[PDB]
Structures are given as structure tokens and as C-alpha cells.
Write a protein that binds this ligand. Sequence first.
Ligand SMILES: NC(=O)c1ccc[n+]([C@@H]2O[C@H](COP(=O)([O-])OP(=O)(O)OC[C@H]3O[C@@H](n4cnc5c(N)ncnc54)[C@H](O)[C@@H]3O)[C@@H](O)[C@H]2O)c1
Ligand SMILES: NC(=O)c1ccc[n+]([C@@H]2O[C@H](COP(=O)([O-])OP(=O)(O)OC[C@H]3O[C@@H](n4cnc5c(N)ncnc54)[C@H](O)[C@@H]3O)[C@@H](O)[C@H]2O)c1
Ligand SMILES: [Zn+2]
Ligand SMILES: [Zn+2]
Ligand SMILES: [Zn+2]
Ligand SMILES: [Zn+2]
Lengths: 346, 338
Amino acid sequence: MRAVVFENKERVAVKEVNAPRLQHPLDALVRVHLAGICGSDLHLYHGKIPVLPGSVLGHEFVGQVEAVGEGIQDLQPGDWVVGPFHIACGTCPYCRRHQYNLCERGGVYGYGPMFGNLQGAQAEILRVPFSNVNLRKLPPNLSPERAIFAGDILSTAYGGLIQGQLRPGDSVAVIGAGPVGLMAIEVAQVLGASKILAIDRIPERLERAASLGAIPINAEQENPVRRVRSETNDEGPDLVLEAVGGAATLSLALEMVRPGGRVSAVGVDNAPSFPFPLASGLVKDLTFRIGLANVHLYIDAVLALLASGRLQPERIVSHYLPLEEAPRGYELFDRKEALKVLLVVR
Amino acid sequence: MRAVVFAVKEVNAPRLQHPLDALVRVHLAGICGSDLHLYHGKIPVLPSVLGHEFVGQVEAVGEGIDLQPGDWVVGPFHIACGTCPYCRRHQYNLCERGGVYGYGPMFGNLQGAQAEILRVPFSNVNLRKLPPNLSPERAIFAGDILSTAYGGLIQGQLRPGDSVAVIGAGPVGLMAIEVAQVLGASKILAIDRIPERLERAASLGAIPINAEQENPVRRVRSETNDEGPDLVLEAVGGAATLSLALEMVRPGGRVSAVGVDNAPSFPFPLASGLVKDLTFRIGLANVHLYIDAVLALLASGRLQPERIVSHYLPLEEAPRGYELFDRKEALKVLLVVR
Ligand SMILES: NC(=O)c1ccc[n+]([C@@H]2O[C@H](COP(=O)([O-])OP(=O)(O)OC[C@H]3O[C@@H](n4cnc5c(N)ncnc54)[C@H](O)[C@@H]3O)[C@@H](O)[C@H]2O)c1
Ligand SMILES: NC(=O)c1ccc[n+]([C@@H]2O[C@H](COP(=O)([O-])OP(=O)(O)OC[C@H]3O[C@@H](n4cnc5c(N)ncnc54)[C@H](O)[C@@H]3O)[C@@H](O)[C@H]2O)c1
Ligand SMILES: [Zn+2]
Ligand SMILES: [Zn+2]
Ligand SMILES: [Zn+2]
Ligand SMILES: [Zn+2]
């Protein structure tokens, strides 16, 4: 198997490694066709997350089924599939509550031993446990390059917005115009937002945000809070989706949002805490949610939207590279020279 | 014109000033946990008539008002206009013309309810006729502490079979425990530090937990499969109890913070928050949203909040009431006015 592996902080290389085999009756093996590099993968790259050298990286994929365990009914070898970046068992108390992101046997592909110790997706073959839970057949008229987003960054943004109770007419602020933010912007549009505001600090990304229908706001060059408020009757938006990570942007989200509004925090960060407004919080009536995506809950709806053309996430792909050029990909994406990198696996 | 002020003095009775106004002859008036923040040095009050809990009868109504002078009424402790954008979103607690009776100039500068007469603006919005078979002493709770608790729990998405932890077994917490029961909770936990209050919690059906005598987090977790409860209602106020709520609640659960405090902030878990998948809400009650359902529950006997009243005092004995309630000698004090 050709596969991208971690070597040390900020180093990554493509080596020969063993192809995995079926080990459980609900396993499936997937011949990966495309594999993404995610913002989350940068936390690995920068040693923010513990990984052993020689571990296969990546949790974004689309491909075809090679084989299935004796327990799998609805998947055969030909089948084009996509799956959530995180796995779930389907029988623990959290899975029964449909909170698959809190699965007791939960994990994330290619994210090291603190997250299930799973071999990653940037490779020719992927073992998917409990494939009955963790995979979806592609609808017949859907390109793999579109479908791949359903497994991670699109369902993340979608989920953020549904949990944030976005209703038609609502105004929305999105903090972070990276890939996740850009998914959020597009989705917010199709869910009938009356106005969408994108806050970032990189013109290339703000330009992209604007093309998707948002009012761009450079946080380096102005006070985003003052600006967001004037755009929203001096109240603030009904919903804020924060997609950066960290106390700076979270406090921003909480200041920015209107009284009685909702903040949906979706960005990752290491800080153990941040200051949540109390006295002012009581006056303002805030609803706040923070968490990792629960992709399984949303993936079927996201796929139906992709298949029908309502969403076109692949437009944000700046680079399709061969698997062997992965280390360049990581450098590009890290240095913010690529917007989204997709790896073609031969 | 008898009225409690930040002692009980004579003050001028208010008159109708607008065609939606109503004047209410207050018959019972409560002293609330919120009133204790006034009492101590926490909320600014002009050295003014106190209180926001009332039940009484209609004296008079503006030309624009389903209410006549005989009628027994109750109303939210906070007022709302019914036409501003927040009122139209049914977020009456965020009314742009909003305020809280007898709660000083930072909250609408309104004359309080611990007094013989109350002016109620926009009474079309801010009042309800009592259903025919409902005692005033039961009804009064619909205007403030019962609806507050009820609201906290419905917003916290309490579903039948859920387990619930309530932090604070004061009057609000006790409302929450009784409500949680009637909404089909499988198990309710009450955390406080005062035996009298924990005994009361226990009689209502909760497992009492003394936070002075044991780690409430450990204990709550063992009572809830080592997960934590589905929902936590925090009913005390302040960073200590909020952090407690957030530690205690299970992953993927919900915290509904309803306790008042003046600190500008508290530390919300971030890295651990992401792992946990928390939903958090903090706010002042939106009574108008819930009052109609609460009244139906009261009228039909499903809730009996008046059982927590330890003292019915005459208006004039109010200062002893405040002392008793502050010192934690009374559980709930209701003032009888005429
Ligand atoms: N919650 C989940 O389960 C889940 C799933 C996938 C990704 N994520 C997270 O969501 C975030 C988005 O992923 P991505 O691929 O878009 O990452 P990215 O790093 O490629 O995008 C981040 C964007 O935020 C911008 N930004 C950074 N600091 C900023 C600041 N102070 N003010 C304004 N803008 C700022 C950057 O310029 C960049 O455009 C990451 O934190 C990622 O780990 C979470
Ligand atoms: N959100 C709203 O709109 C709203 C409405 C009504 C009341 N409130 C607030 O709810 C809170 C409770 O109201 P109440 O009338 O029940 O008042 P209360 O003063 O009787 O409640 C305090 C109770 O909490 C317990 N307690 C205090 N600190 C504690 C700690 N560190 N650990 C454990 N237990 C502790 C005490 O034993 C006491 O019984 C008050 O802060 C009040 O302002 C808010
Ligand atoms: Zn990812
Ligand atoms: Zn599970
Ligand atoms: Zn009160
Ligand atoms: Zn209003």
C-alpha cells in the first residue's frame, strides 16, 4: 500500500505500508479514490495532537468497496461510498441517543492513539469498522469530488447551522472563511438566510466568501462587531457560527450575536477555558453550543443536497495532487497557499 | 397606599396613564431570592417600592382592555410591550420597553408589587385571569419562580425518562424539582448545603446531596451510570455553581442556568468542552411564553407550589420577613396585604 505517514513535527512522507485486512464481520475495505487534507490535519502536523511515527494520516475519503464482512447486507464490492471522519458503534448508549460523535467505542481515522488509534485515509485502502453505521452508498448521479465533503467539513458546517436553529429569514455571522466557514456560507444561503457575514483576515478567502453571497469583513482592518451590528439593525445576527477555534473568536461570537440569539462553536483549540459573560449573559439571553461534529446525524440530508446540485462544495478545491505529492500539499495548505487540497490516489 | 420600600411607609397610589393600563389591588405579594440581591449591596435601588411577585384583583382598566374590576389576576414579574421586534419573536424578556417591577433603575425603574396597588402597563400582555377554581396563593407562583423553573426545564429540553440535576434547593430549585417530576423525569438530584432545604427537596422526590459534606460531581455521576444527568438546572448564581453544572452534566447533555449573579464572567471549558459537546443557556425568564401552560397545570392540581410557603405575614411585618428569608429561617415568605 502506498500511504502518507507522519515522521515528526512538520514532516510527512509517502511510504509503503501493509494493506489492512477484514478483522470483524461488520468491517469493509475501501479502495480510496480521493483523500482530503483537513484543517484538523494541521494540528497533527504541528504536534498539537499526539501521533506515533509511521502512522497513516487522513480522515477525508471517497472510494469503492473492495470487500465486506459476513455481516454486511447493503454494500457489495463495486459500490461507491463515503463515510464520516469519525466512527461509531451503533449500540452504546450514546449511539442509541443518536449522538454518534460521543460513541464509547468512538474514534477518528488517522488521528493517533488518543482517538481510537485508527489507520488513516490518505492511502490506497481503508478499513472501516461497523461499516453498517459508518458508510453511505453514493446516490447514482453524484461525483466523488463533490461527495467527499459530506464525510467531514460540509456536514460539520451544516450540523453547526442546524443545531444553531437557523431558520429562513435569519441573519448569520460566520467567523472563519477557511473551508469549513465556506461550507457554512453556502449552506446558510440555501437554508434561506436573509443576510450572511463572513469575518476573516485573508483577502483571498474573503473574496471567496463574497462570491458565495456573504458580506466580507476583514478583522485586521476594522472592528467586526461594530460592522456586523450596523448590518443587522444594530442588534447583531440571529446566529453566529464560529469556525476558527480559540478564546479570541469565541468572545467575539458572544459579543457579536444579538440578544436572544444563538452561537454555534465548531472550531478546535487547546486552551482549557475562555471567559463566558455572566451578568451581561443573563441580560442578553444566550444559547451556546460547542462540540465535535455529529456527522452521521446529517450525512443523509447532505448527500441528497449534493446529489441534487443545491450545494457545490468542490468549487473550493484549489489543488488536486497525486498521492506522492502529499508533502507539498501539506506545505501549501499549512502556508495558506492552497485553499483545499484533494489527493488523487491511483 | 401602604407599601414596602428600600420598611413600610405611605406612598402615593398610582393612576391609569394609558388605554392598556390596569390597576391591581394586590392581595398577596412575595419576597423572592432576587429581592435578596437588592437587600444586600448587589443591585442598585433608589432609597422606592420593592417586589415583583403578586396576585390580586383588578381595580380599573384603560379604555382599550377581557378584564373587569372583579377579576382575579396574576402577571409576569417582567413587563413587555407586545409589538417590538423581540416581542414579535416571542422573546418577551428582551422587550425593548421591558422592565422588572420594583427592581430599580437598571430594570425599567418600576414601582414594586409589595404594595396595596400595582399599575400594570399593557395589561393585555402582562396579565392573566385566574381560571375559576384556582387559589390566589397557588396562582401567584405562575408570575415568577414556577415559570422561571418551568421555562429553564423546557428550554433545557427535558424529555421523559431524562435524569436531572438541580443546583440550589431554594424556592426556584424546589419548583424545578416538582416540575421535573411531572414532566416524567426518571431521577432528579438536588444539590444544596442546607439540611432543611434538602429535606424539602427529598419530600418532593429528589435525591438530596449536601455539597458541604461530599463531592456532588462524584455522587451525581454514580447516580447516573457514571455519565452524569441529561440536564442540569443551575438555580443559585455565580461561577462556582456554573462550573459545577458544566462538570456534572453528561457529555452531550444540556445546562440551563437560571441563577442571578453580578460577576462579569466565568471560565467555560473549551478543549474539554469540545470533547464533551455541551449546550448551555443563561438568561432571565421568559415568563409570558410559559404562564398559560403553568396556569393550566396549577388549576388542575398537578402542581402545588404553595406547599413551600413557610410564612404568611402581614404587610407591616415585611422587615422581619426579609430577615427571616435572608437568614434562611423562612423558606418562602408571602405578604398578606388588604
Ligand atoms: N467540530 C468538528 O468536529 C470539526 C470538523 C472539522 C474541522 N473542524 C475545525 O474547524 C476549523 C476550520 O477548519 P478549516 O479546514 O476551515 O481550517 P483552516 O485553518 O484552513 O481555516 C481557518 C480560517 O480561519 C482564519 N482565521 C484564523 N485566525 C483568525 C482570527 N483570529 N480572526 C479571523 N479569522 C481567523 C484563517 O485565516 C483561516 O482562513 C478548524 O479549527 C478545524 O480543526 C472542526
Ligand atoms: N433567571 C431568572 O429570571 C430568575 C428568576 C427567579 C430567580 N432567579 C434566581 O434564582 C436564584 C435562586 O432563587 P431562590 O428564590 O431559590 O433564592 P435562594 O437564595 O433561596 O437560593 C439559594 C439557595 O442556594 C443554596 N446555595 C447557595 N450557594 C450554594 C453553593 N455554593 N453550593 C450549594 N448550594 C448553595 C442555598 O442553600 C440556598 O437555599 C437566585 O439567584 C435568584 O436571583 C432567577
Ligand atoms: Zn477533518
Ligand atoms: Zn457507540
Ligand atoms: Zn423573582
Ligand atoms: Zn416588546
